[PDB]
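Run Thaumatin-1 through structure prediction, thanks.
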Amino acid sequence: ATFEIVNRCSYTVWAAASKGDAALDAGGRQLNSGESWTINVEPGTKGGKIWARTDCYFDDSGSGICKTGDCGGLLRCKRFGRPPTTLAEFSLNQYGKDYIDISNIKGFNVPMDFSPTTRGCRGVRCAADIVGQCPAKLKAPGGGCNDACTVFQTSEYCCTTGKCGPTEYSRFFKRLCPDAFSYVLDKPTTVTCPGSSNYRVTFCPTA
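Sure, done. The structure for Thaumatin-1 is below.
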């Protein structure tokens, strides 16, 4: 499956793509403003994620640090990124269908649109200025807007038992981005796409 990852931000981002225990394609790449990076994701990929990382520094070996979404200091991500990270999540060829969503469960750093480039389904978008409107207690000094679980580490925010409800913090992400997951047990905003669809992830789709 092809994913075109497009940076429409006015600033450089370092795209990342991983399934948690492995990189997807090269796992990461620098994208200057306006740049597009096309990756190939293995059919059947379950629990894949794509995200942007901001304010990165990498040495000649591809080792360094990012202010948001750092994946163990590597340019080419093999694991998930450090929150806050707006996440494009997907599971492909799951009983003949693909499933896509955008999640704010691990916070938000950059606005995003995640849409199929093929027929048969609608895209999802979280393009609002969540960082600018971020509640004081969720603001991440290094940039972005943390989810409540990251900040507070409570059973209620982290939905440890699977018996949690919405909160003042989850309602904030939900109000700004109705189409993205705001907490673990949020009413699913997952989109069902034909199996083997192709996609485009766009950072800063509006600005």
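The chain has one domain: 1-207.
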